[PDB]
Homo-oligomer: A and B are copies of this chain.
Amino acid sequence: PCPWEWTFFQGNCYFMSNSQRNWHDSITACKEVGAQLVVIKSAEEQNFLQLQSSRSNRFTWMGLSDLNQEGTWQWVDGSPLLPSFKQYWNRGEPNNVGEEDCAEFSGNGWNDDKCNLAKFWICKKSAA
């Protein structure tokens, strides 16, 4: 079903890292094992993820950014951020303070931060 020590959720497998890497570095790592920097597809999936971070209080990268075009948030799979996800941003976010182009789970919601900072991350890939 899911690789050793990965967590199963609705037909998908997730891996909450223990190391901290910058955003692009997080991507090549999920790459190595055939997974993707978690792209959130549904409210249910988001609650589950947000809880994985919330419960351990770790800042975690997700596969969402506005690197290509400031203000225009897009998932690593290319799908644009849906208006129905705005609610997930923490108050005042995304504020792009000092140029923040990457989304992370922070507190009970999301925050945009500098993509060069080292954070925990989550990989995702289809279950067996």
A residues adjacent to B (C-beta < 8 A): 1-2, 4-5, 7-11, 14-19, 21-22, 24-25, 28-29, 32-33, 41-44, 47-48, 51-52, 55-58, 70-72, 77-79, 83-84, 86-87, 89, 91-99, 114, 116-118, 126
Known: A70-B114, A70-B116, A71-B72; 16 extra A-B contacts, CB below 8 A, are A5-B29, A7-B18, A7-B43, A7-B84, A10-B87, A47-B83, A48-B87, A51-B83, A52-B84, A57-B57, A77-B116, A86-B87, A87-B87, A91-B94, A96-B99, A99-B99
Contact B92 A95 (CB under 8 A): yes
Question: Do A126 and B116 form a contact, CB below 8 Å, given A25-B41, A28-B11, A91-B86?
Answer: yes
